[model samples]
Target: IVGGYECKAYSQPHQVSLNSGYHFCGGSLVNENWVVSAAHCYKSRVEVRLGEHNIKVTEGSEQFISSSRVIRHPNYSSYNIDNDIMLIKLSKSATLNTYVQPVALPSSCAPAGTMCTVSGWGNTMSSTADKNKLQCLNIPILSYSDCNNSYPGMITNAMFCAGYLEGGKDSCQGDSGGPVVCNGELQGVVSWGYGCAEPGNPGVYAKVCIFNDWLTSTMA
Candidate 1:
């Protein structure tokens, strides 16, 4: 349940359209009027909608902004879905109120055991997708040893892990590039995971710490 709840943060609840309310996941709100989602989420004519929670929203209730640009990370290869991350530039800036605040990106790297949070309107449990409200949770950081030992394969310095071995929280489908924050700074982007709340497999993220220079340089 934790992993499924956490996975919700990686998708939906952003200014993006859904063909059928579930498919390739993405992220939101990295830059003003811009959302950073995943490249794989670009399978259709995505309509970014704000204010409305859940997978389906009233088309007239909120404005669905078109993208200005979709910048996928240079190293993001379609073949390797793990390293994939992208930016969804909105045609205009939306009102950043309580429900639409921007999440901070880490200018520095974070060590293990960092307390961070992720949010989204993803599936409450595996194989489901929520479209009315966004869910969030606070999870602990896992060290390289504990994390790597838990999921011997796929865990890397380029990647990060969180949640518990007993399985209470994590991120999965739909939650991609969503901010993984700690100490008021972003530490990771919910990248991938085995499944919703899989035992001993913490949700994996893309180490935003490693991309500080590249991101700053791009933003600068």
Candidate 2:
């Protein structure tokens, strides 16, 4: 993540890496058997790695599991990038521990201006070596009106933006499908953006609250 610092080791137990031989996207463990991520990150095959602090090192806390099924939102629109969320069912349930746990799903929307924390192992800067350690940044949520104004009718109700309009911080490449936690709950999923921390543009995410019902029903 651009303009962010390395996170405390294993502090974000719910954070996960979506891998296909290598880390391609990030995700959050919502339960022992389910992980939530952006539908745009979907592939025919994916491996979920939990309790990972560094992607390159063999951390003893890590748990590697194969996905049994992947369910993308049926109404997901690639054109508008709406409903860009997905759930992956684990082949076996994860064992909860200090370094591996599930994040609580949001019961309500994170209002505009709410302070939130986003974590990932994405690019830290242009042309830099792949950062192995997990990084995190604190950013504020933007109102629908402000976000829509920035994107000019591209921001939908199912999506929201966070980060500074003046630029400096944001989720960058390889961070898609990562978690944005507000008030200790999973409120957003990294989805897309105009560019990495550009002026007048903030990182957009799938509003988790808008798909709460869909998530619960699919997990059932």
Which one wins on TM-score?
2
What's the true lDDT of residue 125 in model 1? 71
> Which ranges of candidate 1 are over 4 A from the true structure?
1-24, 43-45, 55-63, 126-131
Q: By summed lDDT, which 10 consecutive residues of candidate 2 come out lowest?
A: 122-131
Residues 21-115 of candidate 1: C-alpha lDDT, one tens digit per residue = 45345465655666666555654345566554544545334555666666667777566465555666677887665445566677677778878
The true-structure Cα RMSD of candidate 1 reads 4.1
Pick out the ten consecutive residues of candidate 1 with the lowest summed lDDT.
10-19
Best candidate according to lDDT: 2
List of clashing residue pairs for candidate 2? none
Q: For candidate 2, lDDT tens digit of each residue in 1-220? A: 8888789999899999999989999999999999999999988678999999999999798999999999999999989889999999999999999999999999899899999999999888844434799998999999988899899989888999999998989998789999999999999999999889888989999999989899999999
lDDT of each: 0.62, 0.92
